[PDB]
Amino acid sequence: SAFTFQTLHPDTIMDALFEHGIRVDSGLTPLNSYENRVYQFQDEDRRRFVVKFYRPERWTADQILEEHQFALQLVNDEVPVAAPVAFNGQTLLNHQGFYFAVFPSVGGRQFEADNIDQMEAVGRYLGRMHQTGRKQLFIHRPTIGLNEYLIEPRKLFEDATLIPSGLKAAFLKATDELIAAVTAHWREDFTVLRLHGDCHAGNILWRDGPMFVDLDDARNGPAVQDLWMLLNGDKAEQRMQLETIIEAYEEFSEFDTAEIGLIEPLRAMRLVYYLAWLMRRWADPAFPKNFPWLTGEDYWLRQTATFIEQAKVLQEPPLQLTPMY
User: Which family is this protein grouped under?
Assistant: First the structure.
C-alpha cells in the first residue's frame, strides 16, 4: 500500500520534453507540490508552462484520462481551469516509467476567502463546474465513500510501525470510534457528480476572476465536498458565507441543502485519510523533510484527541436544556 519512491532527475525530464518535441527554452525551474512533481518552463516566445509528472502507482492512465477529459470539457463550458495541452494525439505523455502532462502556466494572485465578493464569484463558477461535472460520472477515478477514506486507512494504521507503540491502542480506539460515528451519519441518499475533489482556498487563484487549479484529486462525490472547505471565521460568519455561496452557486446548479449534514462526516473523512496519505508516501524524502513530527508521540496524542473530539461533533451533546433562539 506504501509507495516505493522513485526519483526523477531534472535531466530525465528534459529528455521527456524532448521526445515529445516540447522545445523548452531556459531552465526547468521546479515548483513545490507534494503529490506530484511539477516543474515550470518558458517556451520559444517565453510563455510560461508547467510539466506535471504524475507520481507512479497513484493513478492509472485510464484515470488521468478521465480528469484530462473533465478539465478539457470544463474549459468548453467556460469554467476557470487550465486544461492540459495536446501533443499530436493525446494529452497524457509518458516518458520512461512516468506519465505526465503539460499545462499553460496560469499565474495570478492569492485568492482571498475573506472578500465575500470573490466568494460569490467562486461559488458561482463552482455552480457551473458541477453543472458540467454532473453530465457523466468517472468510471475509473474513485467515488468518495467510506472504503477509501476510512476502512483502508484504518487497515494501514493497524500495521503502521510509524505510530508509537502502546499509544497505538488508544489511537486505534479513537479511530474506530470515529469511523463508527461517521458511518452512522453517511448516506447514499445524495447526488454524485465529478468534483474538483480538493476545493479549498489553497487550490484557487485570482487574477480578476477565480481560477481553479489542480484536478489531480477530482473524484465522484457530493457537491458539498467542493463547498465546505471554503467556510472560514466565527459561526455567524460561516452562516452567511454558506448562505451566500449557495445563492451564487444556484445560478447554474441547484444545491441540495440537506448535503450540509454530510460536512462533519467529510471533515472526519479527510482527517483520517490524510494520515494514511502521509504515511503511504513516507519513503519520499520530501515527507520526512516537511512532516518530521509525524514520528513523535505529541503528534499521535493530539491526533487521538482530535479524533475523539470529532465524534462528539457528530453526536448531540447532552446539554438537554434545549435552548432555541
Answer: Belongs to the SrkA/RdoA protein kinase family.
State the resolution, in angstroms: 2.8
214 is catalytic: yes
Number of domains, the chain: 3
Quick one: cell of 123?
A: 461559488
Give me the domain span that covers residue 19. Answer: 9-56+84-105
We report the CATH number of the domain holding residue 304 as 1.20.1270.170
Annotated binding-site residues read 203, 214
Binding residues for Mg(2+): 203, 214
Closest to 52 (Cα-Cα) out of 75, 82, 78: 82
Q: Of 11, 62, 114, 214, which is the active-site residue?
A: 214
Find the farthest-apart pair of alpha carbons in the chain and give their distance in angstroms, rounded. 71
> Is 311 part of a structural domain of the chain?
yes
Name the one residue in this structure whose C-alpha cell is 505523455. Answer: 93
Listed in order, strand segments (DSSP E) in the chain are 30-31, 37-41, 49-54, 93-95, 98-104, 109-110, 193-194, 204-206, 210-212, 220-221
Residue 204 gets which letter from DSSP?
Answer: E
DSSP 288-317: HHH-GGGGSHHHHHHHHHHHHHHHHHTS--
Which method resolved this structure? X-ray
